[PDB]
Enzyme design. Structure first.
Site, short mmCIF file in Angstrom:
data_model
loop_
_atom_site.label_atom_id
_atom_site.label_comp_id
_atom_site.label_asym_id
_atom_site.label_seq_id
_atom_site.Cartn_x
_atom_site.Cartn_y
_atom_site.Cartn_z
N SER A 105 0.80 -1.23 0.00
CA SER A 105 0.00 0.00 0.00
C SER A 105 0.83 1.28 0.00
CB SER A 105 -0.94 0.04 1.21
OG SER A 105 -0.25 -0.23 2.42
N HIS A 106 2.15 1.21 0.21
CA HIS A 106 2.99 2.39 0.08
C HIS A 106 3.05 2.89 -1.36
CE1 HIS A 106 4.43 0.90 3.98
NE2 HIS A 106 4.78 2.16 4.20
N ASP A 172 11.54 4.79 -22.45
CA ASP A 172 12.93 4.68 -22.00
C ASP A 172 13.74 4.11 -23.16
OD1 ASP A 172 15.40 4.17 -20.78
OD2 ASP A 172 14.52 3.18 -19.02
N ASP A 182 9.14 -0.33 -22.32
CA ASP A 182 9.75 0.35 -21.18
C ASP A 182 9.34 1.82 -21.24
OD1 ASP A 182 11.21 1.24 -19.04
OD2 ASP A 182 13.13 0.30 -19.68
N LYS A 184 9.27 3.51 -18.18
CA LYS A 184 9.74 3.94 -16.87
C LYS A 184 11.14 4.54 -16.99
CE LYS A 184 8.91 -0.22 -15.47
NZ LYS A 184 9.13 -1.42 -14.60
N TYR A 263 7.91 12.19 10.06
CA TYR A 263 6.55 11.80 9.72
C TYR A 263 5.71 13.07 9.64
CZ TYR A 263 8.07 7.03 10.13
OH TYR A 263 8.72 5.83 9.94
N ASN A 283 16.94 7.27 19.06
CA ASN A 283 17.10 6.95 20.47
C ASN A 283 15.96 6.05 20.93
OD1 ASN A 283 17.53 6.88 23.19
ND2 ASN A 283 17.33 9.08 23.54
N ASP A 286 14.65 6.93 25.50
CA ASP A 286 13.81 8.00 26.03
C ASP A 286 12.36 7.52 26.08
OD1 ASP A 286 12.92 8.08 23.38
OD2 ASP A 286 13.48 10.17 23.05
N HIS A 344 3.32 6.84 23.15
CA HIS A 344 3.08 6.30 21.81
C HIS A 344 2.50 7.38 20.92
CE1 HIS A 344 1.21 4.00 18.56
NE2 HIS A 344 2.02 3.01 18.88
C1 LIG Z 1 11.26 2.63 6.63
C2 LIG Z 1 11.55 1.16 6.85
O1 LIG Z 1 12.85 0.88 6.38
C3 LIG Z 1 13.19 -0.49 6.53
O2 LIG Z 1 12.77 -1.06 7.78
C4 LIG Z 1 12.42 -1.15 5.43
O3 LIG Z 1 12.80 -0.55 4.18
C5 LIG Z 1 10.95 -1.01 5.79
O4 LIG Z 1 10.21 -1.39 4.69
S1 LIG Z 1 10.20 -2.78 4.34
O5 LIG Z 1 11.28 -3.13 3.47
O6 LIG Z 1 9.06 -2.99 3.59
O7 LIG Z 1 10.02 -3.53 5.53
C6 LIG Z 1 10.47 0.40 6.13
O8 LIG Z 1 9.46 0.25 7.14
C7 LIG Z 1 8.13 0.71 6.92
O9 LIG Z 1 8.11 2.01 6.39
C8 LIG Z 1 6.88 2.73 6.28
C9 LIG Z 1 7.23 4.12 5.95
O10 LIG Z 1 7.06 5.05 6.71
O11 LIG Z 1 7.69 4.24 4.84
C10 LIG Z 1 6.01 2.70 7.50
O12 LIG Z 1 4.72 2.95 6.95
C11 LIG Z 1 4.03 4.13 7.31
O13 LIG Z 1 3.34 3.94 8.53
C12 LIG Z 1 2.48 2.81 8.51
C13 LIG Z 1 1.97 2.50 9.90
C14 LIG Z 1 1.34 3.12 7.58
O14 LIG Z 1 0.58 1.91 7.60
C15 LIG Z 1 -0.82 2.15 7.62
O15 LIG Z 1 -1.32 2.39 8.94
C16 LIG Z 1 -1.45 1.30 9.88
C17 LIG Z 1 -1.57 1.51 11.32
O16 LIG Z 1 -1.57 2.65 11.79
O17 LIG Z 1 -1.67 0.55 12.08
C18 LIG Z 1 -1.46 0.05 9.44
C19 LIG Z 1 -1.24 -0.26 8.00
O18 LIG Z 1 0.12 -0.59 7.94
C20 LIG Z 1 -1.45 0.91 7.05
O19 LIG Z 1 -2.81 1.12 6.80
C21 LIG Z 1 1.95 3.32 6.20
O20 LIG Z 1 0.91 3.59 5.28
S2 LIG Z 1 0.87 3.20 3.84
O21 LIG Z 1 -0.42 3.46 3.34
O22 LIG Z 1 1.27 1.86 3.63
O23 LIG Z 1 1.71 4.08 3.14
C22 LIG Z 1 2.99 4.43 6.24
O24 LIG Z 1 2.41 5.69 6.53
C23 LIG Z 1 6.02 1.27 8.03
O25 LIG Z 1 5.33 1.26 9.25
C24 LIG Z 1 7.43 0.79 8.27
O26 LIG Z 1 7.47 -0.43 9.01
CA CA Z 2 13.26 1.88 -17.63
CA CA Z 3 12.54 6.76 21.30
#
Ligand SMILES: C[C@@H]1O[C@@H](O)[C@H](O)[C@H](OS(=O)(=O)O)[C@H]1O[C@@H]1O[C@H](C(=O)O)[C@@H](O[C@@H]2O[C@@H](C)[C@H](O[C@@H]3OC(C(=O)O)=C[C@H](O)[C@H]3O)[C@@H](OS(=O)(=O)O)[C@H]2O)[C@H](O)[C@H]1O
Ligand code: CA
Ligand code: CA
EC number: 4.2.2.-
Length: 480
Positions: A105-106, A172, A182, A184, A263, A283, A286, A344
């Site tokens: 979903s990202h 491309d 291609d 992209k 964020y 950190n 904390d 949190h």
């Molecule tokens: C940044 C991290 O880097 C390494 O750990 C790795 O590259 C990892 O990605 S991985 O390879 O796929 O594991 C990355 O970890 C995730 O990165 C996300 C980011 O910020 O890019 C984080 O996602 C954000 O926060 C999420 C909680 C959100 O998810 C939505 O909300 C919730 C919830 O509140 O419980 C649950 C669902 O996950 C989803 O609806 C993400 O939303 S999104 O729509 O997918 O974009 C995003 O805002 C993620 O948490 C990291 O673990």
């Molecule tokens: Ca390409």
């Molecule tokens: Ca902390």
């Protein structure tokens, strides 16, 4: 004065993850059944920066529905004629770490149209991808394809409906081209030497400056080590500048006590590039398990290249190393816990600035441990009227995931029981009132919003079963 001016179906089958939620232990055994499993959330269409009005059109991007399809799609809606013309691109959603069986979903489809030369821009299907091989996290699945940019010749946005086809878009044809379908591009500058400058990015988002210049920013990095990067479209030369950082990555090597992620969002507002966010320090000793604080800065340079300042007008070190320079307040102060990781902060943060220069932040704080007896949870609205010295900060607020603005007012817009609602307040105030609540018609699962022209463009997916669901565009007049 809020009222629905139009609702328009765009398709019957955009992609949606209807399967089971996977995790660290299970994501490598995704269902091969008809159900589409996912790793984060279910949403991927009508999600992200996917809707843009341009003159009398509205452009929308989506993923073609059917677990087995997944094509990048672009639609152009003609507001006067009612015609919706769609282009189907070859690229198909590649899923969690490049495995299409696990929904990701990202990986939204960001979209922009240049008012200056009518070119179309799309960046899509990206989540921190880099070049690596069979032994890396991504198993070599993004080599020469870790940044995915598609774009049209000049004037593509205004062509007759019969000419709005994939033939408007540029292939491309570089040394790294993967072949004849291609579409992209690995960089936005047209120079493959820049490719490392486009590595490991997520979240494509576009803005238009007051002079018609397209701006773009994305997030580098991860949780507790990240940076915002931004660039600008050179319409004259039909290419973009290299990305420039808002803050340094690896801050601990640039002079900071700790690494931190961000964020929040950069936004172009009141004719300036600005940022609002909460930090995620590296950190882990904390009191904040994830995010803390509220930060804000703006740039007096038209392209954001220097001259940054905090809310009090004090010069900000740029690129920023120490978030302390631009901190407004600590949401952590509204909950009593002090033990490590007891606080949190993740959801419920956004910000805006009105045309009158009222500054508004919303946030949310709760106890990490939901089972504790003195469990606490507050939503916060921090706002400063234009002609005020300090911020007013209140927990007399229900909370929200976004805040919007138009003219003199701020809005909260979302879904309640499947139907859009709008709440409105005077800029610089906490006086929200429900002014609009749709009450009949098909209901919606999720959507994404773009504000412009005193209207909300609410790009929505209808509720239903399966992984191919309809998309509707609603145009809501905010009546300011
Ligand atoms: C940044 C991290 O880097 C390494 O750990 C790795 O590259 C990892 O990605 S991985 O390879 O796929 O594991 C990355 O970890 C995730 O990165 C996300 C980011 O910020 O890019 C984080 O996602 C954000 O926060 C999420 C909680 C959100 O998810 C939505 O909300 C919730 C919830 O509140 O419980 C649950 C669902 O996950 C989803 O609806 C993400 O939303 S999104 O729509 O997918 O974009 C995003 O805002 C993620 O948490 C990291 O673990
Ligand atoms: Ca390409
Ligand atoms: Ca902390």
């Amino acid at each position: 004065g809020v009222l629905l001016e139009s609702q328009t179906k765009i398709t019957d089958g955009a992609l949606h993850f209807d399967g089971k939620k996977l995790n660290h232990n299970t994501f490598e055994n995704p269902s091969k059944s008809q159900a589409y499993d996912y790793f984060f959330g279910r949403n991927i269409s009508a999600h992200g920066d996917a809707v843009k009005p341009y003159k009398h059109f509205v452009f929308m991007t989506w993923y073609k529905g059917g677990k087995e399809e997944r094509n990048v799609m672009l639609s152009r809606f003609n507001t006067k004629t009612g015609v919706v013309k769609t282009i189907q691109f070859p690229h198909r959603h590649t899923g969690f770490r490049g495995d299409p069986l696990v929904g990701e979903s990202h990986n939204t489809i960001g979209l922009a149209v240049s008012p200056l030369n009518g070119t179309i821009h799309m960046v899509y299907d990206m989540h921190a991808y880099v070049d690596d091989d069979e032994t890396g996290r991504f198993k070599g699945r993004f080599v020469d394809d870790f940044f995915r940019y598609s774009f049209s010749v000049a004037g593509a946005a205004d062509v007759p409906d019969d000419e709005f086809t994939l033939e408007q878009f540029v292939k491309d044809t570089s040394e790294l081209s993967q072949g004849a379908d291609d579409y992209k591009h690995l960089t936005m500058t047209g120079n493959l030497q820049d490719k490392e400058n486009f590595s490991a990015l997520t979240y494509p988002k576009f803005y238009t400056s007051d002079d018609g210049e397209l701006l773009h920013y994305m997030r580098w990095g991860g949780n507790n080590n990240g940076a915002y990067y931004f660039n600008k479209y050179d319409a004259k030369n039909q290419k973009w500048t290299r990305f420039t950082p808002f803050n340094h990555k690896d801050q601990k090597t640039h002079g900071n006590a700790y690494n931190w992620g961000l964020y929040g969002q950069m936004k172009y507002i009141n004719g300036k590039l600005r940022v609002g966010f909460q930090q995620n320090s590296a950190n882990n000793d904390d009191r904040f398990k994830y995010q803390n604080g509220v930060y804000y800065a703006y740039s007096d340079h038209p392209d954001g290249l220097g001259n940054w300042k905090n809310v009090d007008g004090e010069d900000m070190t740029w690129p920023l190393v120490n978030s302390d320079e631009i901190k407004i307040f600590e949401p952590g102060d509204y909950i009593d816990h002090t033990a490590p990781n007891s606080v949190h902060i993740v959801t419920g943060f956004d910000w805006t600035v009105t045309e009158n220069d009222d500054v508004h932040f919303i946030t949310h704080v709760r106890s990490t441990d939901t089972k504790r007896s003195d469990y606490k949870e507050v939503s916060i609205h921090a706002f400063k009227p234009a002609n005020a010295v300090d911020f007013t900060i209140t927990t007399d607020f229900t909370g929200a995931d976004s805040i919007y603005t138009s003219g003199d007012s701020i809005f909260i817009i979302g879904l309640k029981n499947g139907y859009p609602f709008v709440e409105k307040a005077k800029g610089g105030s906490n006086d929200f009132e429900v002014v609009y609540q749709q009450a009949s018609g098909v209901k919606f699962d999720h959507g994404t919003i773009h504000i412009e022209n005193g209207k909300a463009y609410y790009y929505l997916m209808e509720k239903g079963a399966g992984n191919a669901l309809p998309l509707h565009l609603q145009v809501i007049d905010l009546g300011v």
